[PDB]
Design an enzyme around this catalytic site. Structure first.
Site, mmCIF file in Angstrom:
data_model
loop_
_atom_site.group_PDB
_atom_site.id
_atom_site.type_symbol
_atom_site.label_atom_id
_atom_site.label_comp_id
_atom_site.label_asym_id
_atom_site.label_seq_id
_atom_site.Cartn_x
_atom_site.Cartn_y
_atom_site.Cartn_z
ATOM 1 N N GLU A 1 -29.099 28.672 10.943
ATOM 2 C CA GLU A 1 -30.479 28.297 10.580
ATOM 3 C C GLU A 1 -31.473 29.367 11.014
ATOM 4 O OE1 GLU A 1 -31.059 24.319 12.113
ATOM 5 O OE2 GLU A 1 -29.349 23.548 10.972
ATOM 6 N N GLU B 1 -24.084 21.494 7.264
ATOM 7 C CA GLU B 1 -24.784 20.387 7.943
ATOM 8 C C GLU B 1 -25.619 19.634 6.944
ATOM 9 O OE1 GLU B 1 -26.991 20.796 11.570
ATOM 10 O OE2 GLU B 1 -25.807 22.503 12.298
#
Ligand SMILES: OC[C@H]1O[C@@H](O)[C@@H](O)[C@@H](O)[C@@H]1O
Ligand code: NA
Length: 367
Positions: free
Chosen positions: A169, A286
């Site tokens: 991320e 995710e």
């Protein structure tokens, strides 16, 4: 057809990648984070999972998390004991499951956690004053990985393959290795060093490397450019991953359910197109709806939009986040159901889908 960046990967690691490449067209492996460690309403049992309690089956993919390992802690940042984690990894692998590991690395400059934005990347990379720290940090994973090994009757060492998903991320600004806290070039240097150190210096042969931007900080009008912010190169990545909680009901997303469904499909379609161009494998690394407040979440908001488009469907797996223990964590946070939870029956339907594979449905992945 895809080939690993580790040309000397163990037979089992090579087999896993090859089998994911084959299975992805018609199937989707389901994953869950910390699935054996605890559930919303239990902790301590050495062979239990909320996922299994609902469906009768373990997830196909088991996610684990190393944050704190680098500090010599006996348990990770969520109080998962590392020795138990090694046991659970070996147990899941022994049953034919897949292992993936992320790493919320603590901030070495301040001692704070990954969300402490004190700059550190420039200091950690080769030539930086804290480069010795980066090596020491990575060494703790090398040691952890040794605690996963077995030795056969011929004296040969075997390991579970691991889909290693570091520095995730990074296009977000919430981690210290993220945008605004590290230059793009420094991030790339950090990634490349991580691969060189583990693959080439330390000669780990049981890793598959997963790259995972966050969709919430990608401009959907220019997906590829956003996705490739901080991309370290094809010689450094095996899995073209994506973290996308945004299009599955994130509280801060004002988009209608219908626009979210369309965005989920579009994000995965483009992800797969990128993977295809690069000769890699794509995955939704995710996702989830925190507290599972959406009716028929599994079939209508996750499986439906994935299955709607043959490109989007070519992702190999989808992992949802952890089922935090309530009595310990003081709040409700969970992404898989537990018995009696409102989406439990719809999760059974998700499991029952011919497309979706849980552990009990996997072919032999390791050859
Ligand atoms: O597992 C690492 C972190 O993941 C986040 O999404 C939350 O669940 C945190 O409470 C946790 O520490
Ligand atoms: Na199934």
């Amino acid at each position: 057809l895809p080939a690993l960046i580790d040309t000397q990967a163990t037979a089992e690691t090579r087999a896993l990648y090859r089998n994911l490449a084959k299975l992805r067209y018609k199937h989707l492996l389901f994953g869950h984070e910390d699935s054996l460690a605890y559930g919303v309403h239990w902790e301590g049992d050495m062979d239990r999972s909320d996922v299994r309690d609902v469906t009768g089956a373990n997830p196909a993919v088991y996610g684990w998390e190393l944050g704190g390992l680098e500090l010599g802690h006996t348990a990770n940042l969520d109080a998962v004991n590392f020795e138990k984690m090694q046991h659970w990894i070996k147990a899941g692998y022994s049953r034919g499951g897949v292992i993936t590991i992320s790493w919320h690395v603590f901030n070495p400059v301040s001692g704070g956690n990954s969300w402490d934005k004190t700059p550190a990347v420039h200091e950690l990379i080769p030539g930086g004053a804290r480069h010795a720290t980066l090596k020491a940090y990575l060494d703790t994973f090398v040691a952890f990985n040794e605690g996963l090994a077995d030795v056969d009757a011929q004296g040969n060492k075997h390991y579970p393959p691991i889909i290693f998903r570091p520095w995730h991320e990074h296009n977000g600004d919430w981690f210290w290795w993220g945008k605004g806290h590290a230059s793009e070039q420094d991030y790339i240097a950090l990634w490349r060093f991580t691969v060189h150190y583990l693959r080439d210096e330390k000669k780990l042969r049981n890793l598959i490397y997963a790259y995972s931007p966050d969709r919430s900080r990608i401009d959907m009008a220019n997906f590829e450019a956003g996705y490739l912010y901080g991309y370290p190169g094809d010689a450094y990545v095996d899995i073209i991953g994506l973290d996308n909680y945004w299009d599955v009901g994130h509280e801060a997303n004002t988009a209608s359910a219908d626009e979210q469904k369309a965005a989920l499909t579009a994000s995965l379609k483009q992800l797969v197109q990128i993977a295809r161009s690069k000769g890699k494998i794509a995955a939704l690394t995710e996702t989830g709806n925190n507290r599972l407040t959406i009716d028929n979440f599994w079939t209508e908001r996750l499986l439906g939009p994935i299955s709607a488009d043959a490109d989007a469907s070519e992702i190999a797996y989808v992992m949802v986040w952890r089922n935090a223990n309530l009595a310990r964590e003081k709040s409700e946070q969970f992404f898989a159901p537990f018995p009696g939870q409102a989406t439990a029956d719809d999760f059974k339907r998700f499991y029952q889908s011919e497309v979706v594979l849980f552990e009990d449905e996997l072919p032999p992945l390791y050859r």
